[PDB]
Amino acid sequence: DLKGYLDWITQAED
Amino acid sequence: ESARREVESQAQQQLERAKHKPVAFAVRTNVSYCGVLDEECPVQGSGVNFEAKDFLHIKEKYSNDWWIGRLVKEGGDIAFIPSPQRLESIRLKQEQKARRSGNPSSLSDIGNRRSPPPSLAKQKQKQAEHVPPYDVVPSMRPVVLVGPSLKGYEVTDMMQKALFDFLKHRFDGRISITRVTADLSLAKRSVLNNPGKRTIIERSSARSSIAEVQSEIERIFELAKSLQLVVLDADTINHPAQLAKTSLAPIIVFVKVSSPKVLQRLIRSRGKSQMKHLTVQMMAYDKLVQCPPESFDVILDENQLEDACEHLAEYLEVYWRATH
């Protein structure tokens, strides 16, 4: 679950 | 009688004449009824079998009794939808088939108390709420994203901005993106005849932000009139029930996480600034997830960015296709 969410909050705006 | 056949032919000819004209507006039906069973329809056998919480697209004007509308569902053909007066008439006719409607019960007492129906037995009374049978709703339901944390904070900001950017990139030239800074949760309709018409009266509500809220309401209405898809980036909505009873009733898009532990690790990877509000974000996520899914329009349990983005993609595509 974290693998698909860590990049979710990283390449979106960060 | 040749008059009925002649008016049927004229109505049909008007139907195929206006079949290819721009749509005027749209409303929502909160009652379940069939437009084919009624004998007052201008065209018989071509009624619409709409149910509760259904949408129709009205293009032209017929009379004060019926309108011309189109089914929102894909492949929907032309149909007739009654006017609010006709809907009220059929609602009155629905309960007139019973033995009694007023106060005098039929419990084996006939011939003693005739009890003519007073105004309380008619629709003149029961005006305390008076929920309108037809509501002026925007032609398209706006798209909003909810969860999994508070709006305006980092986690939700990225997790919604990614999808917003994907939608903007994929729907280039056919979609518009706007941010509603003003509040939208107070989208009421039966508060007063004209609350704060002028801002110079210096009343209690004159200096408030209700005027901006209303102005944004008609802005959303006219933007939805343009038939172009528009999503909302407003950061003043945090619960499906806040705007479920309002006129807009936007398409609630709910994103969820399997367990709060995954989110706790996610904010653990962000920093201390989000760690400070970790508690309130967890509380809001728990409150939002306690709500049954049927309140939200669509659900997104996908862990990966792609699956969720493309899923909302075909949902928006079929919403666009079915409307036309």
Q: Can you characterise this structure?
A:
- This is part of a larger assembly, with chains A (14 residues) and B (324 residues).
- Chain A is mostly helical.
- In chain A, 36% of the residues lie in helices and 0% in strands.
- Chain B is α/β, with parallel strands linked by helices.
- Chain B has 2 domains: 140 residues, no CATH class; 184 residues, no CATH class.
- Chain B has 8 helices and 10 strands.
- A 5-stranded antiparallel sheet of chain B has the order 4-3-2-1-5.
- In chain B, a hairpin with a 6-residue loop joins strand 3 and strand 4.
- Classes of the chains: A mainly alpha (14), B alpha/beta (324).
- At the A-B interface, helix 1 of A face helix 3 and helix 5 of B.
Task: Chart the SSEs and their pairings.
This is part of a larger assembly, with chains A (14 residues) and B (324 residues).
Chain A: H1 2-6
Chain B: H1 2-18, E1 25-29, E2 54-61, E3 66-71, E4 78-82, H2 84-94, E5 134-135, E6 143-146, H3 154-170, E7 175-178, H4 210-225, E8 229-232, E9 251-255, H5 260-270, H6 272-276, H7 278-290, E10 298-300, H8 305-323
Helix pairs in contact in B: 3-8, 5-7
SSE pattern of chain A, N- to C-terminal:
H
Counting structural domains of chain B, the number is 2
How many strand units of chain A? 0
Question: Beta-strand percentage of chain B?
Answer: 5-15%
Major beta sheet of chain B, specifics?
5 strands, antiparallel
Question: What spatial form of chain B do the alpha-carbon principal axes imply?
Answer: globular
Major interchain interface with per-chain residue totals:
A-B, 14 and 20 residues
